[PDB]
C-alpha cells in the first residue's frame, strides 16, 4: 500500500510574501492549535498505510494537514492569509468527509476548528 | 471504516 507524495511545502516558481496576517497565522493561530491536546492526528499527512485506510486517498483528493501548513508558513510559501486559511479549512473538511459524526477524530477536529475560528475572527491589519 | 479511538495528547 502507498501514500501519495505529500502536498508541496516549497515551490521555486511561486511568489512568496510575508504579511502581518500570515505572521499571525503562524505565531498565534498555528502555534495555539499545534500545542492543543487534540492536535496530534493533524500534525502530519494522513498515513493511510499505517492506519490501513486503503480508501482514504480514493475519497480525499486534496489532502491537507497542519505539518504541511506549518512548513508552508515557515517557508513563506503563501502570498496571502486567505491561501493559508483555505488550507486549514480543507484539512477540517477532509476530516468531516471521511469520518463520521461522533468519531473521536471528528470531535477533535470540531474543537480545533472552533479554536481556529476564534483566532481568525481577530486577524490583524497590515 | 474509520480511524478508531483516539486519546488526547
Residue numbers in the entry:
A (entry chain A): 42 to 167
B (entry chain B): 115 to 123
Paper lines:
To better understand the binding behavior of BET BRDs toward these non-histone peptides, we structurally characterized interactions with a di-Kac peptide found in E2F1 (K117ac/K120ac). Both lysines inserted within the Kac-binding cavity of BRD4/BD1, with K117ac directly engaging the conserved asparagine and K120ac initiating a water-mediated interaction with K117ac, similar to histone H4 peptides (Filippakopoulos et al., 2012). Our data therefore suggest that Kac-XX-Kac motifs beyond those found in histones can be recognized by BET BRDs.
Bromo and extra-terminal (BET) proteins provide a recruitment platform initiated by the recognition of acetylated lysines (Kac) by their tandem bromodomains (BRD, Dhalluin et al., 1999, Jacobson et al., 2000, Owen et al., 2000). BETs, like all of the 42 human BRD-containing proteins, contain additional interaction domains that recruit other proteins to the acetylated protein target, forming complex assemblies and contributing to processes such as chromatin remodeling and transcription. Direct targeting of BET-BRDs by small-molecule inhibitors such as the high-affinity and pan-BET specificity thienodiazepine (+)-JQ1 (hereafter referred to as JQ1) enables their displacement from Kac. Multiple decreased interactors harbor sequences that can directly associate with BET-BRDs in canonical or new BRD-mediated structural binding modes, and we propose that the tandem BRDs present in each BET protein may be capable of simultaneously recruiting both a histone and a second interactor.
